[PDB]
Structure formats: structure tokens, C-alpha cells
Amino acid sequence: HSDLTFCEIILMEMESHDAAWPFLEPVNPRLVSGYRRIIKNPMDFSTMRERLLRGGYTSSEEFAADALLVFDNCQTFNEDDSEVGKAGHIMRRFFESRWEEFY
Numbered sequence: 001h002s003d004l005t006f007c008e009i010i011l012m013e014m015e016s017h018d019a020a021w022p023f024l025e026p027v028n029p030r031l032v033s034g035y036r037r038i039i040k041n042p043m044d045f046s047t048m049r050e051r052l053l054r055g056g057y058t059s060s061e062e063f064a065a066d067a068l069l070v071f072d073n074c075q076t077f078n079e080d081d082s083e084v085g086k087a088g089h090i091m092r093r094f095f096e097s098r099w100e101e102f103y
């Protein structure tokens, strides 16, 4: 239980983060040219929220994979000095930091 209880804590903390704005909702491929072709497994905080709420995470490890996928996607599609890339680096370092000072 404590495993999934922390997942809620961190997801909430990511959702409300200043740098979270690129990752709150699925990327809209109609608005982002090339996104469909380049990113095979899209992921975002609202998708993780839906699954978490509907109980669909077996372990804290499955949750971490989705979180890391968000930031791997970010780094694959965006330049590191792009506005989205900069936000993703802040978010990625925030996640790894929060996650580790518990596990």
C-alpha cells in the first residue's frame, strides 16, 4: 500500500510543478509535426493519473517506468536547449530526486 501511496504523492507533486506544463496532457500530434513518427510510446501525467486512479499499477516500478518514459520521450523529441527540453530536464531531475529519497 505504501508503495502506491508514494506514487500518488509524487504524481501530485509533478502535476503541480512549475515545469510540468509540457507533460500534463497527451501531446497533440496534429499540432506537433513529426511527433507521431518519432515517439513510439507516448506518455504523460494525465495518462499516468488515469491508470493510477483506476488501480492499474501493480508495483511502484511500473509507475516509475511510465514517469521515465515521459522524460525519455521528451529528450528524444526535443532539443536540450528548447523550452520543452529545459522543462523536461527540470522535471526529470525532480522525479529522480523525489523517488530516491524514499526508496
Ligand SMILES: CCOC(=O)c1cn(C)c(=O)cc1Cl
Pocket (backbone or CB within 6 Å): 021, 022, 023, 027, 032, 073, 074, 077, 078, 084
Ligand atoms: C503543452 C504543449 O506542450 C508541447 O507543445 C509539447 C510537449 N511535449 C511533451 C513534447 O514532447 C513536445 C511539445 Cl511541442
